[PDB]
Design a protein around this ligand. Structure first.
Ligand SMILES: [Mg+2]
Ligand SMILES: [Mg+2]
Length: 227
């Protein structure tokens, strides 16, 4: 298909986010590459405004599910690649249990041969010394299942999942995710049967990088459909 064919090799990625969380305004730029053949992502993000005012882990899901590996027998269920190159809008509400929420609106599309994710993020209702604004979350990341369903009147998809952020005291900060995706272009997209994406992520630091930053290595496989 046109869209899937754009992902058979290594594709460079750019991420650009502007955020406002409880009036703390910040921006992040990221770069790296994806290899959807292996479900593989490598990205490095820089906060360009100084110190990031929320913990890096809380932004991982916001910072390109077209790089998930869809098994061959599941090709017909890959909405994300089918919207390319024109792209899709991706919107979420991320509800941090007993704390505030993020609302995000992003557009994921090609600019030339580069896959771009441009995001606007708004966070409200955060506690000044909760786990987010108080920076109480460990610098690590768990493995999740992203449950996808068709959203036929939008010509797109929805997703619902729970992200678990470990807290430095050993507890966990839940971040409920609700997601909607809508194609931007006029080409045919794929409306999938129910399925999920199996995720795993590893966070690290670049020892020579003195700006506030995050290095992310991520592997994602679509699953839940046998034939
Ligand atoms: Mg720049
Ligand atoms: Mg079917």
């Amino acid at each position: 298909s046109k869209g899937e064919e754009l992902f058979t090799g290594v594709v460079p990625i750019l991420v650009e986010l502007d955020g406002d969380v409880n009036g703390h305004k910040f921006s992040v730029s990221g770069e790296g590459e994806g290899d959807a053949t292996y479900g593989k992502l490598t990205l490095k993000f820089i906060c360009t405004t100084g110190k990031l005012p929320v913990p890096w882990p809380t932004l991982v899901t916001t910072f390109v599910q077209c790089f998930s590996r869809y098994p061959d027998h599941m090709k017909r269920h890959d909405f994300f690649k089918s919207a390319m190159p024109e792209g899709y809008v991706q919107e979420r509400t991320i509800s941090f249990k007993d704390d505030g929420n993020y609302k995000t609106r992003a557009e994921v599309k090609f600019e030339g041969d580069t896959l771009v994710n441009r995001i606007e993020l708004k966070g409200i209702d955060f506690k000044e010394d909760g786990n987010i604004l108080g920076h109480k979350l460990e610098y690590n990341y768990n493995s999740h299942n992203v449950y996808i369903t068709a959203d036929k009147q939008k010509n797109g998809i929805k997703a619902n999942f729970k992200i678990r952020h470990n807290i430095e005291d050993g507890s966990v900060q839940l971040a409920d995710h609700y997601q909607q995706n809508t194609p931007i272009g006029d080409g045919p997209v794929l409306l999938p049967d129910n399925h999920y994406l199996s995720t795993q992520s590893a966070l690290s630091k670049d020892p020579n990088e003195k700006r506030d930053h995050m290095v992310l290595l991520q592997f994602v496989t679509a699953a839940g459909i046998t034939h």
